Amino acid sequence: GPVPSRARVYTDVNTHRPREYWDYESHVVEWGNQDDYQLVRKLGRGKYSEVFEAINITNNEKVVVKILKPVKKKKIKREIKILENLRGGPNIITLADIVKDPVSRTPALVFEHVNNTDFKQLYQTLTDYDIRFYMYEILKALDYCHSMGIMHRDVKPHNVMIDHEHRKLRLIDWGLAEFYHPGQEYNVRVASRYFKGPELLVDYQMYDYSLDMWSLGCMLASMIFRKEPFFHGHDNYDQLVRIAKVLGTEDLYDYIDKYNIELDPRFNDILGRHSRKRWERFVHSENQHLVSPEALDFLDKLLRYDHQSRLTAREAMEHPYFYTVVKDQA
Numbered sequence: 001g002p003v004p005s006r007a008r009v010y011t012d013v014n015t016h017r018p019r020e021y022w023d024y025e026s027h028v029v030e031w032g033n034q035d036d037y038q039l040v041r042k043l044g045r046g047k048y049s050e051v052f053e054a055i056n057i058t059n060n061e062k063v064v065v066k067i068l069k070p071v072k073k074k075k076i077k078r079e080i081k082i083l084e085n086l087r088g089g090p091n092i093i094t095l096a097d098i099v100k101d102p103v104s105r106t107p108a109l110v111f112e113h114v115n116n117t118d119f120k121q122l123y124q125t126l127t128d129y130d131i132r133f134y135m136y137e138i139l140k141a142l143d144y145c146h147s148m149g150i151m152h153r154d155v156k157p158h159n160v161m162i163d164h165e166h167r168k169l170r171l172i173d174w175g176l177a178e179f180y181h182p183g184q185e186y187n188v189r190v191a192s193r194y195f196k197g198p199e200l201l202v203d204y205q206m207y208d209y210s211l212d213m214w215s216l217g218c219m220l221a222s223m224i225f226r227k228e229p230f231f232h233g234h235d236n237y238d239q240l241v242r243i244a245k246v247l248g249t250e251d252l253y254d255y256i257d258k259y260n261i262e263l264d265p266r267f268n269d270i271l272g273r274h275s276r277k278r279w280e281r282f283v284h285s286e287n288q289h290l291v292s293p294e295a296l297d298f299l300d301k302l303l304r305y306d307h308q309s310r311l312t313a314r315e316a317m318e319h320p321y322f323y324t325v326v327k328d329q330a
């Protein structure tokens with residue numbers, strides 16, 4: 001069978017907490033009053049929810065309501081518990097309230113309003129400094145949630161809200177997040193295809209916080225190289241092929257050997273043999289102003305097959321790429 005793995009950091013953080021912190025199945029949801037909110041307009045739709053701008057009529061505050069499509073009570077409890085545990089943490093979206101439609105019995109999460117600028121219009125405006133700044137802000141949220149025993153498991157641009165005028169950022173959509181427990185075998189069917197870590201793609205279930213760091217690396221690559229998505233796979237199998245064409249097959253097969261991973265036979269046809277590419281092949285006159293030795297060194301240290309060898313969030317924050325950001329923040 002596969003070789004076990006443990007997180008290098010924050011390994012036992014949940015074991016040391018009271019059971020109630022992580023044992024979300026036992027959480028009792030306190031429902032507020034749906035009549036306190038009036039819906040104003042629809043903001044967006046997902047697979048599993050619809051998001052509206054609303055007003056809290058008790059105090060006239062603008063709020064956001066995420067009405068859940070039908071999902072298991074345990075998964076709703078998980079998201080609520082995680083949001084409550086992380087409330088007040090750096091750059092974490094604040095859950096303000098939880099309500100039910102009395103007739104249709106559908107649950108709705110009520111959040112703080114963030115004045116988001118279209119992240120699909122915000123990447124053509126981003127300077128080198130801006131990317132470093134916002135990356136640092138995301139790392140603060142990830143170090144925090146990891147330190148609190150939580151993997152986000154769905155890091156990607158859609159789940160980062162930015163109020164550019166206020167240089168404000170929030171990490172949202174905790175619906176896939178999970179508590180880290182040493183030894184636990186997780187579902188690999190998480191995250192968007194383009195952001196999935198090698199561990200997911202090869203079906204290695206004993207993963208950890210380091211998944212988030214792969215996803216972050218994918219984001220960074222897409223931003224500095226102006227190539228969204230960076231690893232553009234056609235399906236989950238081809239996704240690993242696209243990664244292998246960059247990181248190379250030698251390190252991939254080393255990873256599978258180290259963890260005694262049983263690779264789906266389907267892969268044997270399509271993976272082939274690929275050299276590890278230098279990052280210089282993605283640099284061009286359009287993106288060169290975003291790319292530095294520091295950026296490439298940092299990126300290289302996020303995008304590793306071996307989850308254990310990726311930078312931690314706290315290590316990433318200490319990287320020379322962020323020296324200018326750190327100097328200004330005091």
Ligand SMILES: CC(C)Oc1ccc2ccn(-c3cncc(-c4ccc(C(=O)O)cc4)n3)c2c1
Nearest residue numbers: 043044045051064093111113114116172173174
């Ligand atoms: C599906 C959702 C992310 O789509 C949108 C689209 C446009 C906009 C424009 C503003 N928002 C907005 C403003 N303030 C907060 C949020 C929000 C907050 C949390 C979550 C969540 O799940 O955790 C989803 C959305 N959202 C939008 C949300």
